[PDB]
Amino acid sequence: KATKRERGLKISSVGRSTRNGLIVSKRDIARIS
Amino acid sequence: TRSSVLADALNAINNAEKTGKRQVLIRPSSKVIIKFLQVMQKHGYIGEFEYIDDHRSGKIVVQLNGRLNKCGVISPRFNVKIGDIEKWTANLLPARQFGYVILTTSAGIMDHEEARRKHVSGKILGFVY
RNA sequence: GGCCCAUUCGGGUCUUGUAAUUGGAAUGAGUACAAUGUAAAUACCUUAACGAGGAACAAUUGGAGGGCAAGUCUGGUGCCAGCAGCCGCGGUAAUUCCAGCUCCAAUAGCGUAUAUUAAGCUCGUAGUUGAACUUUUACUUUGAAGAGUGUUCAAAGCAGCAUGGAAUAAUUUAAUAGGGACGGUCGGGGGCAUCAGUAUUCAAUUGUCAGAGGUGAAAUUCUUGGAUUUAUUGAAGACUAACUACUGCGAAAGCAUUUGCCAAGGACGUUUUCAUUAAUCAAGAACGAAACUAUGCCGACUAGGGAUCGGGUGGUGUUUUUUUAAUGACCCACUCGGCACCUUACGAGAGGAGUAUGGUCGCAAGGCUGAAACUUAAAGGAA
Numbered sequence: 154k155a156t157k158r159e160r161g162l163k164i165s166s167v168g169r170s171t172r173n174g175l176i177v178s179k180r181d182i183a184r185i186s
Numbered sequence: 187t188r189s190s191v192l193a194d195a196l197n198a199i200n201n202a203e204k205t206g207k208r209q210v211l212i213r214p215s216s217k218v219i220i221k222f223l224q225v226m227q228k229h230g231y232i233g234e235f236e237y238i239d240d241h242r243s244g245k246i247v248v249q250l251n252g253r254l255n256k257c258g259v260i261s262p263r264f265n266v267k268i269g270d271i272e273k274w275t276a277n278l279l280p281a282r283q284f285g286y287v288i289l290t291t292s293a294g295i296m297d298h299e300e301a302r303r304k305h306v307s308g309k310i311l312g313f314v315y
Numbered sequence: 316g317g318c319c320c321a322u323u324c325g326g327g328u329c330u331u332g333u334a335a336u337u338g339g340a341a342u343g344a345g346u347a348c349a350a351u352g353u354a355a356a357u358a359c360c361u362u363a364a365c366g367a368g369g370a371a372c373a374a375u376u377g378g379a380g381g382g383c384a385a386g387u388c389u390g391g392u393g394c395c396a397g398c399a400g401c402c403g404c405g406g407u408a409a410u411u412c413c414a415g416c417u418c419c420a421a422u423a424g425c426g427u428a429u430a431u432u433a434a435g436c437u438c439g440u441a442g443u444u445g446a447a448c449u450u451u452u453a454c455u456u457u458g459a460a461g462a463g464u465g466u467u468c469a470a471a472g473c474a475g476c477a478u479g480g481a482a483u484a485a486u487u488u489a490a491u492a493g494g495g496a497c498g499g500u501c502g503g504g505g506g507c508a509u510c511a512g513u514a515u516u517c518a519a520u521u522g523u524c525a526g527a528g529g530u531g532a533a534a535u536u537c538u539u540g541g542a543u544u545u546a547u548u549g550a551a552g553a554c555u556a557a558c559u560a561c562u563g564c565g566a567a568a569g570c571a572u573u574u575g576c577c578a579a580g581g582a583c584g585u586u587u588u589c590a591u592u593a594a595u596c597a598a599g600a601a602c603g604a605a606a607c608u609a610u611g612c613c614g615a616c617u618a619g620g621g622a623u624c625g626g627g628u629g630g631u632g633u634u635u636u637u638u639u640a641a642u643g644a645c646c647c648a649c650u651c652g653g654c655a656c657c658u659u660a661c662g663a664g665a666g667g668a669g670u671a672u673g674g675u676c677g678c679a680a681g682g683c684u685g686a687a688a689c690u691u692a693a694a695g696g697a698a
C-alpha cells in the first residue's frame with residue numbers, strides 16, 4: 154500500500170498534457186521554429 | 187469544460203488499449219476522426235474499424251491489436267515549415283524513427299513522412315506512436 | 316636494502332641507495348670590435364674577442380610531517396598527559412651543530428579573502444473552452460567558422476515582389492449537448508392557516524397528613540395558611556417520543572402530528588417542441604460559546620457484487636374482489652436515475668530526542684520570633 158505506483162517512463166517534453174490534448178505554449182513554438 | 191470530438195475519440199482509444207479491451211466504441215464521429223484512423227490503420231496501430239450510420243453524427247467501432255502505445259491531439263494548431271518538420275519530430279516523439287507526427291496540409295491529413303515525400307506542409311493535427 | 320597493498324594481522328616484488336668521488340664536450344643570458352636596422356637612434360636578426368661546476372651566472376609560491384635540551388608552562392591517582400620549545404650552564408670569531416631535518420605539488424608563476432556557477436452553497440461578469448453535415452486573406456511550396464601559405468614553430472599577417480497549393484482558421488441532422496411541453500407520480504423541500512398529543516409550569520377545586528426536592532454528605536428552596544402525593548378541570552409556552560433506517564427531500568444551513576390552500580422541485584415515460592441556445596468562471600448578487608483523536612492516496616478511469624429509494628416494461632400466482640367510483644400489496648427478470656458499502660482493470664498526477672556550560676540576564680542560602688542604636692519584658696517556637 155505505501156509504495157507509490159510505478160509511473161512509467163517520460164516520453165515527451167514539448168508541452169503540458171491535458172484532457173483536451175497536449176498543449177504547447179507560444180514561447181515554445183518560436184523556440185523550435 | 188468539454189473536449190473536442192477528436193480528442194475524446196483519441197482518449198477513448200488510449201484507455202481501451204491500456205485496459206486490455208479489444209474493441210472500443212467512439213461517439214460522435216467526423217471526417218477528421220476517420221482520416222486520423224485511416225492514417226493509424228495504414229501504419230498498423232489498429233485493425234479494421236467500422237462506421238455505423240445512426241442518422242446522427244454517427245458511431246465508430248475500432249478493433250485494437252495492441253500495437254498502440256499512445257495517441258494524442260496537439261493544440262494550438264500551430265503551423266510548421268517543411269524543413270522544420272524534423273525538429274518538431276525530435277521533440278514530440280520518443281526517438282528519431284519511432285512514431286509518426288500527423289499534419290493537416292494542403293493535400294489533406296497525413297503523417298509527416300508522406301508530407302516530406304510530397305513536399306507539402308501546414309498545421310499539425312496530432313501525434314501517434 | 317628499496318618500494319606497493321592492507322582497519323586488523325600481515326601480504327606482494329626486485330638492481331636498488333648515496334647526505335661519495337670524477338671527465339671532457341655543448342650553449343645562452345650577459346659584456347661587446349663591428350656591421351645591418353633607422354630621418355637619426357633604440358629594439359630585432361647576424362657576428363670577431365671575453366662570458367660555466369656551488370655551472371654563487373645563487374627562480375619562486377604553497378602544503379604535509381618529523382625529532383632534540385641539566386629549557387619554560389599547565390592538569391594529575393609517584394616515573395604521566397597536554398600545550399609547546401629562535402629563550403639551555405659558558406661562548407658571538409664563539410660555534411661546525413639533525414643529512415644544511417624529511418617529503419609532496421605548480422613553476423615564470425603561485426597563494427589568501429569575498430562573491431559566484433555546476434466559512435459554506437447556488438447563480439454569475441471578464442478570460443478560457445465547446446455536437447455533426449454540404450471570392451479574399453492567414454498559412455504553406457517554388458524563383459528572384461572555413462580554403463591556401465615553413466612568419467625558423469606559434470600567436471599573427473597575406474593574396475517587400477512573382478508564383479503553385481485539395482486540408483486547416485477567418486472572410487440538413489434533431490448530440491445517451493441544452494431548453495420547454497405533456498402523463499401518473501414521489502418526497503420528514505418551502506410559505507400561510509388548521510388539527511392532535513402526552514409531558515413541563517401555573518391556577519381552580521379535592522382526599523390525607525409531615526415531611527418533600529437535591530448531593531457523595533450538605534447548604535439553599537417549598538411546607539399544618541396542607542408541601543410532595545392522590546382525583547377532576549382550565550390556561551400559557553415549547554416540542555413533535557416510540558415507528559427513526561450507514562433511509563427520503565433541499566443548493567447549503569436544515570426538514571419528523573393531521574387537514575386544506577399557494578406556488579416550486581427531481582427522476583421516470585413520450586414516435587410531442589426550439590435547434591446549438593452550451594461548459595468552467597476571478598468580479599458581483601441571493602441565502603447562510605464552539606472544538607477536543609480524526610485519515611480517505613488522486614484522476615480524464617475498467618468490469619462488477621449484495622442491499623436500498625423513486626419511476627417504467629414484461630412475467631406470474633397469491634393477497635385483492637362482484638356493473639357505485641377508485642383500484643393496489645407481495646415475488647421474479649430487465650432498465651433509468653439517486654444515497655451509501657465492498658471489490659477490481661488503467662493512468663508523468665510533472666527535524667525529533669538529549670547532554671554540558673568559569674558567558675549575559677533573572678530567581679535564590681542561612682542563622683529561633685519578639686529583639687534593636689538596647690545581650691531587653693511578656694507571649695510563642697523548639698526540645
Ligand SMILES: [Mg+2]
Nearest residue numbers: 337338339368
Ligand atoms: Mg662534472
Ligand SMILES: [Mg+2]
Nearest residue numbers: 437438595596
Ligand atoms: Mg459553482
Ligand SMILES: [Mg+2]
Nearest residue numbers: 440441442596
Ligand atoms: Mg462569459
Ligand SMILES: [Mg+2]
Nearest residue numbers: 489490491492
Ligand atoms: Mg434529443
Ligand SMILES: [Mg+2]
Nearest residue numbers: 493494495496
Ligand atoms: Mg425540463
Ligand SMILES: [Mg+2]
Nearest residue numbers: 496497498500
Ligand atoms: Mg410535471
Ligand SMILES: [Mg+2]
Nearest residue numbers: 501502504505
Ligand atoms: Mg407537499
Ligand SMILES: [Mg+2]
Nearest residue numbers: 504505506507
Ligand atoms: Mg408543508
Ligand SMILES: [Mg+2]
Nearest residue numbers: 551552553554
Ligand atoms: Mg399547545
Ligand SMILES: [Mg+2]
Nearest residue numbers: 555556571572
Ligand atoms: Mg411522531
Ligand SMILES: [Mg+2]
Nearest residue numbers: 554555571572
Ligand atoms: Mg412542525
Ligand SMILES: [Mg+2]
Nearest residue numbers: 502503562563
Ligand atoms: Mg420515508
Ligand SMILES: [Mg+2]
Nearest residue numbers: 650651652653
Ligand atoms: Mg442503477
Ligand SMILES: [Mg+2]
Nearest residue numbers: 564565653654
Ligand atoms: Mg440528495
